[PDB]
């Protein structure tokens, strides 16, 4: 391939009637930089026109649309697929070259494009057109399944996925996607050994993707109160063994190293974690996980001013306006002023899309409690804010009452609101103390403004 | 205050799905 690169830039500058020279240029460029492939196709489109005004074969045009698919040029990628299908139609008699099959994969690409338009209606149309004419194909059979997976798991999503194994049980991609469905059901955690054992046949092995999935379903077992019972210690070392195995078979996997750093961070080695995550950090920043795991270390050194910025940097993806666990992992030991009131604003943003959470309404009660005790104790503060303080702690007591009546918690019962209730009662006493001080500061500001009134009369 | 905010802190790890790059004839 490097010698191919050398010969290709031995001939690209040349022209011994170069025709396909750009075709086999870009034919290796698809692994490499895509823009080089674009440029090769660009003059390759021209070069088929001067010797004779010959229409570009649709395999070229489909592939350049395929390039623009991973680029921002989605619309003219669609135009490329349209004119590709037309040129295949212009290959009226070419069942030797099988323009029909080329149209099949072209339509597959165009349906994948309609998915990028989020035109899932026409994506459904193209997919069912292909499957009604070539039902032996699997990728269309499961992208349809993936589309309904975006709607949900127990749809015909899961059933297209299972029948994709029924048409092809040898198919590792679909078979992986079977257990990918089961990632939604984490209560089907220990059951995933079987549904990720089926193609641990060694024809499929080695499957890095699946064995990292084993490591991941093995790590979600952690953060339980049974580590002291050596159970999660064994789980940590078993995940470590998986990670050593994927380490030896691949040094350059990055999700592996994320897994090693995660399990050792669960082992309490957080100074020993930011380094290993730093490696995958330069390797590629575009892994959503490592953004979180680094800031967990930062807040473990209480480095909030290094952490929350990178949290909202993780929020710079076009995925979800209020991801819940990220603002949870944001509001952890947040103790300064913006770490209190803007913390409340973040909790309100989360609560706006997630008013169902008991933990979130507990945590807003907690942060309201913190800001209430921040304004009534050594304060000696404004009238209006301590007037808001009594209302906000009253609200906090409403949530203390409300959550305590609820049974289910985050597997830790929140009768801890009761000591908050004794607190807020003594906070009522303190507020009745300090509101008198508020009236005192009001009357003294009245007397000093009288004192300036008299002297300005004197002037 | 007396204790920090509660969390089920986990060093989770996500997986990319199957890409399905548009095909190259």
């Amino acid at each position: 391939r490097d010698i191919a690169k050398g010969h290709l830039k031995k001939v690209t500058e040349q022209y011994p009637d170069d025709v396909e020279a750009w075709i086999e240029l870009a034919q290796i460029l698809e692994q490499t930089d895509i823009q080089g492939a674009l440029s090769a196709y660009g003059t390759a489109t021209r070069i088929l026109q001067e010797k004779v005004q010959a229409d570009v074969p649709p395999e070229i045009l489909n592939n350049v649309g395929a390039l623009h698919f991973r680029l921002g040029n989605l619309g003219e990628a669609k135009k490329y697929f349209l004119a590709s299908l037309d040129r295949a139609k212009a290959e009226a008699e070419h069942d030797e070259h099988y323009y029909n099959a080329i149209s099949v994969t072209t339509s597959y690409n165009l349906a994948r494009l309609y998915e990028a338009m989020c035109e899932f209606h026409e994506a459904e149309k193209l997919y069912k057109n292909i499957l009604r004419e070539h039902p032996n194909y699997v990728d269309c059979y499961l992208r349809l399944g993936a589309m309904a997976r975006d709607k949900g798991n127990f749809y015909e999503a899961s059933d297209w996925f299972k029948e994709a194994l029924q048409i092809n049980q040898d198919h590792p991609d679909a078979w992986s996607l079977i257990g990918n469905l089961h990632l939604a059901k984490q209560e089907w955690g220990p059951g995933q050994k079987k549904f990720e054992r089926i193609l641990k046949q060694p024809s499929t092995q080695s499957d890095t993707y699946s064995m990292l999935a084993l490591g991941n379903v093995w790590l979600q077992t952690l953060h339980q109160p049974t580590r002291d019972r050596e159970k999660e210690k064994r789980h940590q070392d078993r995940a470590l063994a998986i990670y050593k195995q994927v380490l030896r078979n691949d040094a350059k996997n990055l999700y592996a190293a994320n897994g090693i750093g995660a399990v050792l961070a669960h082992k309490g080695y957080f100074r020993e974690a930011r380094d290993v995550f730093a490696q995958v950090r330069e390797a590629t920043a575009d892994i959503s996980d490592v953004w979180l795991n680094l800031a967990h270390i930062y807040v473990e050194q209480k480095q909030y001013i290094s952490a929350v910025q990178m949290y909202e940097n993780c929020l710079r993806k076009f995925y979800k306006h209020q991801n819940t666990e990220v603002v949870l992992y944001l509001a952890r030991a947040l103790f300064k002023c913006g770490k209190l009131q803007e913390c409340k604003q973040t909790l309100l943003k989360a609560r706006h899309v997630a008013p169902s959470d008991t933990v979130l309404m507990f945590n807003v009660a907690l942060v309201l409690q913190r800001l209430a005790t921040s304004v009534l104790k050594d304060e000696k503060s404004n009238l209006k804010e301590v007037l808001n303080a009594v209302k906000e702690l009253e609200l906090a007591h409403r949530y203390f009452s409300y959550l305590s009546k609820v049974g289910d918690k985050m597997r830790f019962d929140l009768a801890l609101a009761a000591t908050e209730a004794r607190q807020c009662s003594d906070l009522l006493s303190q507020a009745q103390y300090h509101v008198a001080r508020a009236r005192k500061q009001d009357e003294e500001e009245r007397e000093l403004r009288a004192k300036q009134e008299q002297e300005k009369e004197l002037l | 205050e007396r204790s920090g905010v509660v969390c089920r802190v986990k060093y989770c790890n996500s997986l990319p799905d199957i890409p399905f790059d548009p095909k190259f004839i």
Binding site: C118, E119, F120, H121, D150, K151, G152, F318, K320, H321, Q345, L348, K349, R351, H352, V353, P355, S356, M361, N388, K391, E392, L395, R398, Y399, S401, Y402 | -
Partner: protein
């Protein structure tokens, strides 16, 4: 077709709800906004330009819903405070605070006659309130998980409810009983709009699917694919010919009711849009978002 007015930094914090009055009770002349900054800014759209008429406060948490009466020039606001404050707009004064205690409160809706006040609740009930009383007259109890979205029939004969995981519940408000329990969605519904004739109904879930249902026999008239993000708010073009779509990706697709076509898209908010409403005919289109900047879209 474009933007007429853009209102730079109209709020301190992110808007969650919009209310633009439709009638000629000086409410076509004004806009009501509901935000996180606890400001209910009454924006007088006068001389085809957007002026602040009132700024209303006291909603101690961020506002979840604002609305303007069909039959009255007054307004009402809700939040996580569970104090559904009722507002008079000619003076910018609060009429009352309806404590929907302790927390059991959600988005509101002015009745077409502006007598009853529906809201969602954590238990799944739909609590109806007297605009004159501030009292929970009766709760439309339909079990589920949580009630997220509601809309009156504007002709005043049905109610529909959107729940926390795609439960669509059809009611006869003349009798307050459940007619159909429709389940075309699985993911949370944030907005739903009765048709101007209340013949159709729109759904806005986390799937970008506008599943349009018939009302008079309560069946699927068709599913419409939308944005890449979560579609959030929807309003009918009041002449019953278009509907607008607020999403979670800084983008507002405008849709035909029949041809199921994005007749236009605006991208103008650099942040996630939250709320939409048309003109009295549907030419002007109001639009809010986390940009704290309000964009007014003329659409002939």
């Amino acid at each position: 077709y474009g933007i007429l007015f853009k209102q730079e930094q109209a709020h301190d914090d992110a808007i969650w709800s919009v209310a633009w009055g439709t009638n000629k009770k000086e409410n076509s002349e004004t806009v009501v906004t509901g935000s996180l900054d606890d400001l209910v800014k009454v924006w007088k759209w006068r001389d085809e330009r957007l002026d602040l008429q009132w700024s209303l406060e006291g909603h101690q948490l961020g506002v979840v819903s604002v609305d303007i009466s069909h039959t009255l020039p007054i307004a009402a606001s809700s939040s996580l405070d569970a104090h559904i404050r009722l507002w008079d707009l000619e003076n910018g004064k609060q009429i009352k605070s309806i404590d929907a205690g302790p927390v059991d409160a959600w988005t509101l809706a002015f009745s077409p006659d502006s007598q009853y006040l529906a809201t969602g609740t954590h238990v799944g009930k739909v609590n109806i309130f007297g605009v004159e009383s501030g009292k929970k007259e009766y709760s439309l109890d339909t079990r589920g998980k949580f009630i997220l979205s509601i809309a009156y029939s504007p002709d005043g004969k049905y109610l529909a409810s959107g729940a926390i995981d795609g439960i669509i519940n059809i009611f006869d408000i003349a009798t307050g009983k459940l007619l159909h329990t429709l389940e075309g969605h699985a993911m949370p519904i944030r907005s739903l709009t009765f048709s101007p004739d209340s013949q159709l109904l729109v759904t806005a879930s986390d799937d970008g699917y506008i599943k349009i249902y018939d009302v008079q026999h309560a069946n699927l008239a068709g599913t419409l694919s939308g944005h890449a993000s979560w579609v959030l708010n929807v309003a009918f073009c009041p002449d019953d010919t278009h509907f607008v779509s607020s999403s979670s990706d800084k983008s507002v697709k405008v849709w035909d009711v029949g041809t199921r076509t994005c007749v236009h898209t605006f991208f103008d908010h650099q942040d996630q849009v939250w709320g939409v409403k048309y003109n009295g005919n549907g030419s002007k289109i109001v639009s809010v978002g986390d940009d704290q900047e309000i964009h007014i879209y003329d659409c002939p």
